[PDB]
Write a protein that binds this DNA or RNA. Sequence first.
RNA 1: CGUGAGGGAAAGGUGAAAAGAACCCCGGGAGGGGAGUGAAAUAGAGCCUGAAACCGUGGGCUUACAAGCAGUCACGGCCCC
RNA 2: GAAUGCCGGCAUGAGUAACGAUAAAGAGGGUGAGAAUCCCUCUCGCCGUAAGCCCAAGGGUUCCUACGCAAUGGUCGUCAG
RNA 3: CGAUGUCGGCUCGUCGCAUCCUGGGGCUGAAGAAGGUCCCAAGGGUUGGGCUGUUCGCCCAUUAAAGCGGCACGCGAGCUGGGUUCAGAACGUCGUGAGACAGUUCGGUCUCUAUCCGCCACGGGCGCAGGAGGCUUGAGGGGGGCUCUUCCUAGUACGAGAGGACCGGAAGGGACGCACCUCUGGUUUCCCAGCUGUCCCUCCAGGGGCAUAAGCUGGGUAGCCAUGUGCGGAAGGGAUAACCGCUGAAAGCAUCUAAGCGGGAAGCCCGCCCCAAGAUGAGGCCUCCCACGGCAGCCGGUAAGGACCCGGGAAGACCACCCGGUGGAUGGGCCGGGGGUGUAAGCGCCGCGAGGCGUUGAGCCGACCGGUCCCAAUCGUCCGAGGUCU
Lengths: 118, 59, 7, 204, 131, 122
Amino acid sequence: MRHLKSGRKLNRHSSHRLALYRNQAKSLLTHGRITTTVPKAKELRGFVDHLIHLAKRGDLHARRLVLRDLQDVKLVRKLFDEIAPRYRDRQGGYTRVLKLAERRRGDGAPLALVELVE
Amino acid sequence: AKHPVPKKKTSKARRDARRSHHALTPPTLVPCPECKAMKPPHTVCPECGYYAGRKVLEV
Amino acid sequence: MTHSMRC
Amino acid sequence: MKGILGVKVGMTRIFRDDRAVPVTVILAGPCPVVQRRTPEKDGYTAVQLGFLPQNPKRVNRPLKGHFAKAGVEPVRILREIRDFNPEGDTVTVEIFKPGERVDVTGTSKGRGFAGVMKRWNFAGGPDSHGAHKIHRHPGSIGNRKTPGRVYKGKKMAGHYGAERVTVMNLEVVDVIPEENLLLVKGAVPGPNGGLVIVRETKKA
Amino acid sequence: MNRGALIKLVESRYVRTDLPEFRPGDTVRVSYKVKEGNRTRIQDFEGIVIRIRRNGFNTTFTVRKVSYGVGVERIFPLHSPLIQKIDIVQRGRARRAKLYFIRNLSDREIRRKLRADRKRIDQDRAAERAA
Amino acid sequence: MIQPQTYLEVADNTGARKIMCIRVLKGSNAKYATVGDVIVASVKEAIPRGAVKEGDVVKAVVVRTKKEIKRPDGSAIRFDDNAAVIINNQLEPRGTRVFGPVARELREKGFMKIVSLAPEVL
RNA sequence: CGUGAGGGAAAGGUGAAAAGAACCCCGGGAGGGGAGUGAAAUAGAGCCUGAAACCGUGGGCUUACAAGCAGUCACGGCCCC
RNA sequence: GAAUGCCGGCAUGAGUAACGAUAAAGAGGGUGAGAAUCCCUCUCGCCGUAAGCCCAAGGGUUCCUACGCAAUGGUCGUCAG
RNA sequence: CGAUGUCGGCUCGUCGCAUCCUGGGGCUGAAGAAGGUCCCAAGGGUUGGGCUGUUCGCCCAUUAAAGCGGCACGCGAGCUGGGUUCAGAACGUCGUGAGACAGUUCGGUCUCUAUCCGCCACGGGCGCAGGAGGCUUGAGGGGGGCUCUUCCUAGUACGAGAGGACCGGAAGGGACGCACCUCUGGUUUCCCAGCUGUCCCUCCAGGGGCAUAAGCUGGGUAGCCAUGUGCGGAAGGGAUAACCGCUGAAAGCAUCUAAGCGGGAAGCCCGCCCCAAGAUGAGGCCUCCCACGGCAGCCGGUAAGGACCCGGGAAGACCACCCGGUGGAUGGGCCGGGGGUGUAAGCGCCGCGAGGCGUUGAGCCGACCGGUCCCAAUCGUCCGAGGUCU
Ligand SMILES: [Mg+2]
Ligand SMILES: [Mg+2]
Ligand SMILES: [Mg+2]
Ligand SMILES: [Mg+2]
Ligand SMILES: [Mg+2]
Ligand SMILES: [Mg+2]
Ligand SMILES: [Mg+2]
Ligand SMILES: [Mg+2]
Ligand SMILES: [Mg+2]
Ligand SMILES: [Mg+2]
Ligand SMILES: [Mg+2]
Ligand SMILES: [Mg+2]
Ligand SMILES: [Mg+2]
Ligand SMILES: [Mg+2]
Ligand SMILES: [Mg+2]
Ligand SMILES: [Mg+2]
Ligand SMILES: [Mg+2]
Ligand SMILES: [Mg+2]
Ligand SMILES: [Mg+2]
Ligand SMILES: [Mg+2]
Ligand SMILES: [Mg+2]
Ligand SMILES: [Mg+2]
Ligand SMILES: [Mg+2]
Ligand SMILES: [Mg+2]
Ligand SMILES: [Mg+2]
Ligand SMILES: [Mg+2]
Ligand SMILES: [Mg+2]
Ligand SMILES: [Mg+2]
Ligand SMILES: [Mg+2]
Ligand SMILES: [Mg+2]
Ligand SMILES: [Mg+2]
Ligand SMILES: [Mg+2]
Ligand SMILES: [Mg+2]
Ligand SMILES: [Mg+2]
Ligand SMILES: [Mg+2]
Ligand SMILES: [Mg+2]
Ligand SMILES: [Mg+2]
Ligand SMILES: [Mg+2]
Ligand SMILES: [Mg+2]
Ligand SMILES: [Mg+2]
Ligand SMILES: [Mg+2]
Ligand SMILES: [Mg+2]
Ligand SMILES: [Mg+2]
Ligand SMILES: [Mg+2]
Ligand SMILES: [Mg+2]
Ligand SMILES: [Mg+2]
Ligand SMILES: [Mg+2]
Ligand SMILES: [Mg+2]
Ligand SMILES: [Mg+2]
Ligand SMILES: [Mg+2]
Ligand SMILES: [Mg+2]
Ligand SMILES: [Mg+2]
Ligand SMILES: [Mg+2]
Ligand SMILES: [Mg+2]
Ligand SMILES: [Mg+2]
Ligand SMILES: [Mg+2]
Ligand SMILES: [Mg+2]
Ligand SMILES: [Mg+2]
Ligand SMILES: [Mg+2]
Ligand SMILES: [Mg+2]
Ligand SMILES: [Mg+2]
Ligand SMILES: [Mg+2]
Ligand SMILES: [Mg+2]
Ligand SMILES: [Mg+2]
Ligand SMILES: [Mg+2]
Ligand SMILES: [Mg+2]
Ligand SMILES: [Mg+2]
Ligand SMILES: [Mg+2]
Ligand SMILES: [Mg+2]
Ligand SMILES: [Mg+2]
Ligand SMILES: [Mg+2]
Ligand SMILES: [Mg+2]
Ligand SMILES: [Mg+2]
Ligand SMILES: [Mg+2]
Ligand SMILES: [Mg+2]
Ligand SMILES: [Mg+2]
Ligand SMILES: [Mg+2]
Ligand SMILES: [Mg+2]
Ligand SMILES: [Mg+2]
Ligand SMILES: [Mg+2]
Ligand SMILES: [Mg+2]
Ligand SMILES: [Mg+2]
Ligand SMILES: [Mg+2]
Ligand SMILES: [Mg+2]
Ligand SMILES: [Mg+2]
Ligand SMILES: [Mg+2]
Ligand SMILES: [Mg+2]
Ligand SMILES: [Mg+2]
Ligand SMILES: [Mg+2]
Ligand SMILES: [Mg+2]
Ligand SMILES: [Mg+2]
Ligand SMILES: [Mg+2]
Ligand SMILES: [Mg+2]
Ligand SMILES: [Mg+2]
Ligand SMILES: [Mg+2]
Ligand SMILES: [Mg+2]
Ligand SMILES: [Mg+2]
Ligand SMILES: [Mg+2]
Ligand SMILES: [Mg+2]
Ligand SMILES: [Mg+2]
Ligand SMILES: [Mg+2]
Ligand SMILES: [Mg+2]
Ligand SMILES: [Mg+2]
Ligand SMILES: [Mg+2]
Ligand SMILES: [Mg+2]
Ligand SMILES: [Mg+2]
Ligand SMILES: [Mg+2]
Ligand SMILES: [Mg+2]
Ligand SMILES: [Mg+2]
Ligand SMILES: [Mg+2]
Ligand SMILES: [Mg+2]
Ligand SMILES: [Mg+2]
Ligand SMILES: [Mg+2]
Ligand SMILES: [Mg+2]
Ligand SMILES: [Mg+2]
Ligand SMILES: [Mg+2]
Ligand SMILES: [Mg+2]
Ligand SMILES: [Mg+2]
Ligand SMILES: [Mg+2]
Ligand SMILES: [Mg+2]
Ligand SMILES: [Mg+2]
Ligand SMILES: [Mg+2]
Ligand SMILES: [Mg+2]
Ligand SMILES: [Mg+2]
Ligand SMILES: [Mg+2]
Ligand SMILES: [Mg+2]
Ligand SMILES: [Mg+2]
Ligand SMILES: [Mg+2]
Ligand SMILES: [Mg+2]
Ligand SMILES: [Mg+2]
Ligand SMILES: [Mg+2]
Ligand SMILES: [Mg+2]
Ligand SMILES: [Mg+2]
Ligand SMILES: [Mg+2]
Ligand SMILES: [Mg+2]
Ligand SMILES: [Mg+2]
Ligand SMILES: [Mg+2]
Ligand SMILES: [Mg+2]
Ligand SMILES: [Mg+2]
Ligand SMILES: [Mg+2]
Ligand SMILES: [Mg+2]
Ligand SMILES: [Mg+2]
Ligand SMILES: [Mg+2]
Ligand SMILES: [Mg+2]
Ligand SMILES: [Mg+2]
Ligand SMILES: [Mg+2]
Ligand SMILES: [Mg+2]
Ligand SMILES: [Mg+2]
Ligand SMILES: [Mg+2]
Ligand SMILES: [Mg+2]
Ligand SMILES: [Mg+2]
Ligand SMILES: [Mg+2]
Ligand SMILES: [Mg+2]
Ligand SMILES: [Mg+2]
Ligand SMILES: [Mg+2]
Ligand SMILES: [Mg+2]
Ligand SMILES: [Mg+2]
Ligand SMILES: [Mg+2]
Ligand SMILES: [Mg+2]
Ligand SMILES: [Mg+2]
Ligand SMILES: [Mg+2]
Ligand SMILES: [Mg+2]
Ligand SMILES: [Mg+2]
Ligand SMILES: [Mg+2]
Ligand SMILES: [Mg+2]
Ligand SMILES: [Mg+2]
Ligand SMILES: [Mg+2]
Ligand SMILES: [Mg+2]
Ligand SMILES: [Mg+2]
Ligand SMILES: [Mg+2]
Ligand SMILES: [Mg+2]
Ligand SMILES: [Mg+2]
Ligand SMILES: [Mg+2]
Ligand SMILES: [Mg+2]
Ligand SMILES: [Mg+2]
Ligand SMILES: [Mg+2]
Ligand SMILES: [Mg+2]
Ligand SMILES: [Mg+2]
Ligand SMILES: [Mg+2]
Ligand SMILES: [Mg+2]
Ligand SMILES: [Mg+2]
Ligand SMILES: [Mg+2]
Ligand SMILES: [Mg+2]
Ligand SMILES: [Mg+2]
Ligand SMILES: [Mg+2]
Ligand SMILES: [Mg+2]
Ligand SMILES: [Mg+2]
Ligand SMILES: [Mg+2]
Ligand SMILES: [Mg+2]
Ligand SMILES: [Mg+2]
Ligand SMILES: [Mg+2]
Ligand SMILES: [Mg+2]
Ligand SMILES: [Mg+2]
Ligand SMILES: [Mg+2]
Ligand SMILES: [Mg+2]
Ligand SMILES: [Mg+2]
Ligand SMILES: [Mg+2]
Ligand SMILES: [Mg+2]
Ligand SMILES: [Mg+2]
Ligand SMILES: [Mg+2]
Ligand SMILES: [Mg+2]
Ligand SMILES: [Mg+2]
Ligand SMILES: [Mg+2]
Ligand SMILES: [Mg+2]
Ligand SMILES: [Mg+2]
Ligand SMILES: [Mg+2]
Ligand SMILES: [Mg+2]
Ligand SMILES: [Mg+2]
Ligand SMILES: [Mg+2]
Ligand SMILES: [Mg+2]
Ligand SMILES: [Mg+2]
Ligand SMILES: [Mg+2]
Ligand SMILES: [Mg+2]
Ligand SMILES: [Mg+2]
Ligand SMILES: [Mg+2]
Ligand SMILES: [Mg+2]
Ligand SMILES: [Mg+2]
Ligand SMILES: [Mg+2]
Ligand SMILES: [Mg+2]
Ligand SMILES: [Mg+2]
Ligand SMILES: [Mg+2]
Ligand SMILES: [Mg+2]
Ligand SMILES: [Mg+2]
Ligand SMILES: [Mg+2]
Ligand SMILES: [Mg+2]
Ligand SMILES: [Mg+2]
Ligand SMILES: [Mg+2]
Ligand SMILES: [Mg+2]
Ligand SMILES: [Mg+2]
Ligand SMILES: [Mg+2]
Ligand SMILES: [Mg+2]
Ligand SMILES: [Mg+2]
Ligand SMILES: [Mg+2]
Ligand SMILES: [Mg+2]
Ligand SMILES: [Mg+2]
Ligand SMILES: [Mg+2]
Ligand SMILES: [Mg+2]
Ligand SMILES: [Mg+2]
Ligand SMILES: [Mg+2]
Ligand SMILES: [Mg+2]
Ligand SMILES: [Mg+2]
Ligand SMILES: [Mg+2]
Ligand SMILES: [Mg+2]
Ligand SMILES: [Mg+2]
Ligand SMILES: [Mg+2]
Ligand SMILES: [Mg+2]
Ligand SMILES: [Mg+2]
Ligand SMILES: [Mg+2]
Ligand SMILES: [Mg+2]
Ligand SMILES: [Mg+2]
Ligand SMILES: [Mg+2]
Ligand SMILES: [Mg+2]
Ligand SMILES: [Mg+2]
Ligand SMILES: [Mg+2]
Ligand SMILES: [Mg+2]
Ligand SMILES: [Mg+2]
Ligand SMILES: [Mg+2]
Ligand SMILES: [Mg+2]
Ligand SMILES: [Mg+2]
Ligand SMILES: [Mg+2]
Ligand SMILES: [Mg+2]
Ligand SMILES: [Mg+2]
Ligand SMILES: [Mg+2]
Ligand SMILES: [Mg+2]
Ligand SMILES: [Mg+2]
Ligand SMILES: [Mg+2]
Ligand SMILES: [Mg+2]
Ligand SMILES: [Mg+2]
Ligand SMILES: [Mg+2]
Ligand SMILES: [Mg+2]
Ligand SMILES: [Mg+2]
Ligand SMILES: [Mg+2]
Ligand SMILES: [Mg+2]
Ligand SMILES: [Mg+2]
Ligand SMILES: [Mg+2]
Ligand SMILES: [Zn+2]
């Protein structure tokens, strides 16, 4: 049973899955848009949305909280100076997932794009 | 355990009856409103890159 | 594997 | 023989006569009478109750006609209460008085595919002393060449729950008509938000 | 509907607001109404609050005390009608929410671990100066 | 929650110090005993020259349990030991003092003399 | 295959003649479709003949209340000559 | 027509078990008819009295480079002993 | 004998009744209470331990009782392997010996993949003369079915006394069953905190990895849960068993019977709970659609409707089921509440310093109860009646 349980497992143990979210978060904030599998993309939304929101708050505490996940002061600077002001008046919903039409050849996996919002 | 084993060869009739559930369903495709190419619903059009009215992707 | 012994 | 459709709200407890009383709160009323089953027409006696108003932007034409013949707004659920013939056109919580006893029918929580130990309280096997991969297994399921088969009704693993269950003879602790609320002592089948049915008890 | 509010509405007839605020590590005296044979008397129970589990109207708290050589723990519904009053006997300063570890401590180890919460003590004396 | 094999402290002056439950005298097959229940016990440790000695098979009523017991008012109580008082076949204590608190449940179960002898009743 | 003494296989056939298919077409290739050769190409090299098990496509009759060593006897229905 | 016969072919089990250490992956860029699987870059994880380095046996071109992908590689393959 | 695994145990049942208990009875050398004996009765129940491989049995402590048998001495493609039942070794014994012993002693490989029937669950198909969306009847099944203690009646009837009822009423238990998470008590793989060693970011400060597939430790929401909570066994109606009668001949009397009529069990039927019209005997009611175009058929286009796809769900292996799809709160974000942790960072002050204090119940914060269109359920596609015959 899984009754009212939140959060995918993605066939990874607890530290692999966490490192998976951090590395996707680093990649999406680096490039603005990435392709993954649909289930990975859907989980990345909330993980990134929380980090963008903290950058919107912009204080030193919020920068240190984000650096636990993102580690790269350069990237965090970009998130605070360039990315976060884009969303000052947007209350959540900083990311979007759109499904792609063609599966990956080698395992048939449904793919999706994840991107930051305008 | 003690290694269970087919007692009889399955007949052609019985083999094929088991496969009565094996036909594929053809893919569900809708026409893309922009370029009219057929594509899976709820996916970014792979032919012109449009979805929800706007360009999204480079093809 | 030791055979079963019906002895 | 009165009854009413309801929703399981959730459990809490209250204090009555220096005693803690566990209760399940049920939002029951109100239930428009939509159809009456008559011995002349239907062969038996019952009321078709409605419950929860529905967006007409979701009620097809076969259903809209049915509601229309009764002059009722469209409701989300239609359920019959057998051998209930209320005088009015609407059933509310006020048909129950604190102190009466009720039976409550709900859809139990679904365990999906359940093992023999959870489904049937089987004992399993030993967890050591040489037990070989059978710690949760049922053991023997029969005899030998006579009868050479397994009884119908044999308890085995399989789906468990999400089935109709009636818990019988619960006390009505309070009726809060302003809020269409029913307080019932004890536990009631199903999840919060699930549909239940509250009937006057059959125990004497 | 809102089921949470309906439950809170059902419970609102029994919620109390006359009791003092306290924290795990505080020393408290609970005047509790007891039924003994035929009569009902108020029996006090004084000890250390070692746990408060919160759930709105359903929050409860646990008080530990030594009595004639034997440790006694007593669990109280925080909104029970059988509680006459709660008297703050002392503020202690804890570092965690649950104080189960004091079951295995000596009486002087407990005193060294839960020193007086001088701040909340001064805030108590700061109030009670009403006029 | 006392069962066969459970050791219990003796909260009286009968001389016994530790008894081990061998039976829960509550029906045909009760699994557990709680405060107010009677057990049969073997005396595992005693002080010399007392009323009861090591090896005696005795009856005792349970007066304290580490498993907390619940009460209709929604409260519960819990002691640090499991304790019993040795009794005779009329439920009367075979000692003359009871040491430590006892549960108020003993009262309605018919153990009034033990309740009065107790220094505190909780 | 065996350290070794030693053990010890499978595997023949286009056509009279290579005339062994230039060139074009789809394809990354494989493979094919035309063109061409030949008396013949289901003789096209994975090549004489090309059985049987086995697999498949198309058609006729039949089958979802039914008890079977699967046939046999009878009668009826449908399809074919 | 039977010899648990012999040699070969082809079925059934079955789209089933399995795909060989639970050290672990993610993304961007590139190449190509084709890329989860090749190359490059960043992020992550694992060994570190080794899962690193140097000899001796044994193996015998497997070394380096260009061109390849039918088969071999337990998938794929543009990569490769 | 081209193999039907062989004791005991564990697990899982099911059946017989020559009945261990509970229910109903007759006789008693039945005053009462408690027995003895036999009859009816298989609905349910029939405990935990010490010894031994043990079956059995003896013992301890209880109990209403601690029943006896069948199912390949039920059940090793379900487990065990103590015994028995190979090879080693030893003792007693026998044999000159090699060796031998239902004599003993210590040790000794128990085979991942279920084809068919059967069983537990779940889909797909077609049928149920028009086609649909709902709500239902219940043929027929299944589940369940136990019992004790105290009190009142009443210290009454009975009894010299000891003792001690029927009938009727009341309360409280044991085990078992279904459901449940308010409370109690668990778990809660990252929800919070503290801690060590090391490497790293960025030197301090603050952090991150790794030490497990949580490094360790203290806590812990929702969910899933029992040790926790509610509720169940019935009541009642009907027909009976042994047994007891009423009226009553044959047979002037007698006779429960030959005509007829009563009473009478935990058992039987119904009643309770669950499944259930593939109940092909395919049921009933309410509502909706409609006679489309072309040579009981045909083929196309539609109707009421349905499916697909997508967002999901205390529903779930998959499928099914249920909700929702911008006319929207379905998931994700965000916000408020709850809840957990237990006073963040930064700065100021005190201390040589480890630290302490204030800011501050601070900061962080899964799932719970809600709000909010900020993000995604875009756009659509495909089926789908024209109703045989007297
Ligand atoms: Mg499960
Ligand atoms: Mg489930
Ligand atoms: Mg699990
Ligand atoms: Mg959820
Ligand atoms: Mg996660
Ligand atoms: Mg999930
Ligand atoms: Mg896995
Ligand atoms: Mg894995
Ligand atoms: Mg993996
Ligand atoms: Mg996998
Ligand atoms: Mg780790
Ligand atoms: Mg880019
Ligand atoms: Mg990618
Ligand atoms: Mg991926
Ligand atoms: Mg969040
Ligand atoms: Mg700053
Ligand atoms: Mg965080
Ligand atoms: Mg999409
Ligand atoms: Mg797709
Ligand atoms: Mg590939
Ligand atoms: Mg592949
Ligand atoms: Mg086996
Ligand atoms: Mg096995
Ligand atoms: Mg095995
Ligand atoms: Mg096998
Ligand atoms: Mg065979
Ligand atoms: Mg087979
Ligand atoms: Mg065959
Ligand atoms: Mg055939
Ligand atoms: Mg075939
Ligand atoms: Mg088959
Ligand atoms: Mg199949
Ligand atoms: Mg197909
Ligand atoms: Mg809840
Ligand atoms: Mg009240
Ligand atoms: Mg329900
Ligand atoms: Mg329902
Ligand atoms: Mg359910
Ligand atoms: Mg199991
Ligand atoms: Mg169960
Ligand atoms: Mg269980
Ligand atoms: Mg067990
Ligand atoms: Mg067991
Ligand atoms: Mg177990
Ligand atoms: Mg185990
Ligand atoms: Mg096994
Ligand atoms: Mg194991
Ligand atoms: Mg088994
Ligand atoms: Mg057998
Ligand atoms: Mg057999
Ligand atoms: Mg067997
Ligand atoms: Mg048979
Ligand atoms: Mg189900
Ligand atoms: Mg049920
Ligand atoms: Mg009751
Ligand atoms: Mg309301
Ligand atoms: Mg709630
Ligand atoms: Mg103290
Ligand atoms: Mg203190
Ligand atoms: Mg300290
Ligand atoms: Mg301190
Ligand atoms: Mg302070
Ligand atoms: Mg004591
Ligand atoms: Mg003592
Ligand atoms: Mg003595
Ligand atoms: Mg001794
Ligand atoms: Mg002695
Ligand atoms: Mg005593
Ligand atoms: Mg006293
Ligand atoms: Mg060789
Ligand atoms: Mg050899
Ligand atoms: Mg060689
Ligand atoms: Mg040889
Ligand atoms: Mg030739
Ligand atoms: Mg010729
Ligand atoms: Mg060419
Ligand atoms: Mg070409
Ligand atoms: Mg080409
Ligand atoms: Mg190539
Ligand atoms: Mg070619
Ligand atoms: Mg071709
Ligand atoms: Mg060609
Ligand atoms: Mg020619
Ligand atoms: Mg040709
Ligand atoms: Mg030919
Ligand atoms: Mg030829
Ligand atoms: Mg020739
Ligand atoms: Mg040939
Ligand atoms: Mg040929
Ligand atoms: Mg051929
Ligand atoms: Mg073919
Ligand atoms: Mg054919
Ligand atoms: Mg055909
Ligand atoms: Mg039939
Ligand atoms: Mg037919
Ligand atoms: Mg047939
Ligand atoms: Mg034949
Ligand atoms: Mg025939
Ligand atoms: Mg004939
Ligand atoms: Mg022959
Ligand atoms: Mg042969
Ligand atoms: Mg053979
Ligand atoms: Mg032979
Ligand atoms: Mg051969
Ligand atoms: Mg050959
Ligand atoms: Mg062969
Ligand atoms: Mg062969
Ligand atoms: Mg072959
Ligand atoms: Mg075949
Ligand atoms: Mg094959
Ligand atoms: Mg084969
Ligand atoms: Mg196959
Ligand atoms: Mg498959
Ligand atoms: Mg199989
Ligand atoms: Mg499988
Ligand atoms: Mg295998
Ligand atoms: Mg393998
Ligand atoms: Mg597999
Ligand atoms: Mg592997
Ligand atoms: Mg390993
Ligand atoms: Mg390691
Ligand atoms: Mg990445
Ligand atoms: Mg990758
Ligand atoms: Mg990659
Ligand atoms: Mg790539
Ligand atoms: Mg690009
Ligand atoms: Mg590749
Ligand atoms: Mg490729
Ligand atoms: Mg890889
Ligand atoms: Mg590379
Ligand atoms: Mg990166
Ligand atoms: Mg080192
Ligand atoms: Mg060399
Ligand atoms: Mg070599
Ligand atoms: Mg290759
Ligand atoms: Mg290849
Ligand atoms: Mg290839
Ligand atoms: Mg080549
Ligand atoms: Mg290969
Ligand atoms: Mg390959
Ligand atoms: Mg391999
Ligand atoms: Mg290439
Ligand atoms: Mg190389
Ligand atoms: Mg034999
Ligand atoms: Mg054989
Ligand atoms: Mg044989
Ligand atoms: Mg054999
Ligand atoms: Mg055999
Ligand atoms: Mg056992
Ligand atoms: Mg009998
Ligand atoms: Mg009896
Ligand atoms: Mg009797
Ligand atoms: Mg008598
Ligand atoms: Mg007598
Ligand atoms: Mg008798
Ligand atoms: Mg019986
Ligand atoms: Mg029985
Ligand atoms: Mg022992
Ligand atoms: Mg034993
Ligand atoms: Mg024995
Ligand atoms: Mg035997
Ligand atoms: Mg014996
Ligand atoms: Mg008796
Ligand atoms: Mg007895
Ligand atoms: Mg026994
Ligand atoms: Mg037997
Ligand atoms: Mg038996
Ligand atoms: Mg027999
Ligand atoms: Mg025998
Ligand atoms: Mg025998
Ligand atoms: Mg046996
Ligand atoms: Mg057996
Ligand atoms: Mg075995
Ligand atoms: Mg056995
Ligand atoms: Mg077998
Ligand atoms: Mg078997
Ligand atoms: Mg067998
Ligand atoms: Mg053995
Ligand atoms: Mg022996
Ligand atoms: Mg041998
Ligand atoms: Mg010896
Ligand atoms: Mg000798
Ligand atoms: Mg001799
Ligand atoms: Mg001699
Ligand atoms: Mg001799
Ligand atoms: Mg021997
Ligand atoms: Mg023997
Ligand atoms: Mg022998
Ligand atoms: Mg002998
Ligand atoms: Mg002997
Ligand atoms: Mg022996
Ligand atoms: Mg010996
Ligand atoms: Mg032995
Ligand atoms: Mg050994
Ligand atoms: Mg052994
Ligand atoms: Mg084994
Ligand atoms: Mg195995
Ligand atoms: Mg099978
Ligand atoms: Mg099978
Ligand atoms: Mg089968
Ligand atoms: Mg069969
Ligand atoms: Mg079957
Ligand atoms: Mg079906
Ligand atoms: Mg319908
Ligand atoms: Mg519906
Ligand atoms: Mg009817
Ligand atoms: Mg029905
Ligand atoms: Mg029926
Ligand atoms: Mg049937
Ligand atoms: Mg029945
Ligand atoms: Mg019964
Ligand atoms: Mg009396
Ligand atoms: Mg008397
Ligand atoms: Mg009575
Ligand atoms: Mg039972
Ligand atoms: Mg259950
Ligand atoms: Mg629950
Ligand atoms: Mg549950
Ligand atoms: Mg809760
Ligand atoms: Mg809880
Ligand atoms: Mg708790
Ligand atoms: Mg975290
Ligand atoms: Mg560190
Ligand atoms: Mg650096
Ligand atoms: Mg530092
Ligand atoms: Mg700090
Ligand atoms: Mg590292
Ligand atoms: Mg490492
Ligand atoms: Mg460890
Ligand atoms: Mg690791
Ligand atoms: Mg960590
Ligand atoms: Mg805990
Ligand atoms: Mg923990
Ligand atoms: Mg929790
Ligand atoms: Mg909780
Ligand atoms: Mg919970
Ligand atoms: Mg649960
Ligand atoms: Mg329980
Ligand atoms: Mg009756
Ligand atoms: Mg007469
Ligand atoms: Mg008479
Ligand atoms: Mg008669
Ligand atoms: Mg009668
Ligand atoms: Mg009478
Ligand atoms: Mg009667
Ligand atoms: Mg009864
Ligand atoms: Mg039903
Ligand atoms: Mg039907
Ligand atoms: Mg039905
Ligand atoms: Mg009909
Ligand atoms: Mg029908
Ligand atoms: Mg799902
Ligand atoms: Mg699914
Ligand atoms: Mg599914
Ligand atoms: Mg449906
Ligand atoms: Mg519903
Ligand atoms: Mg829908
Ligand atoms: Mg909709
Ligand atoms: Mg739509
Ligand atoms: Mg929403
Ligand atoms: Mg809604
Ligand atoms: Mg929301
Ligand atoms: Mg979700
Ligand atoms: Mg809060
Ligand atoms: Mg709080
Ligand atoms: Mg502070
Ligand atoms: Mg601070
Ligand atoms: Mg600081
Ligand atoms: Mg300073
Ligand atoms: Mg401090
Ligand atoms: Mg937050
Ligand atoms: Mg919050
Ligand atoms: Mg929140
Ligand atoms: Mg709105
Ligand atoms: Mg479209
Ligand atoms: Zn397009």
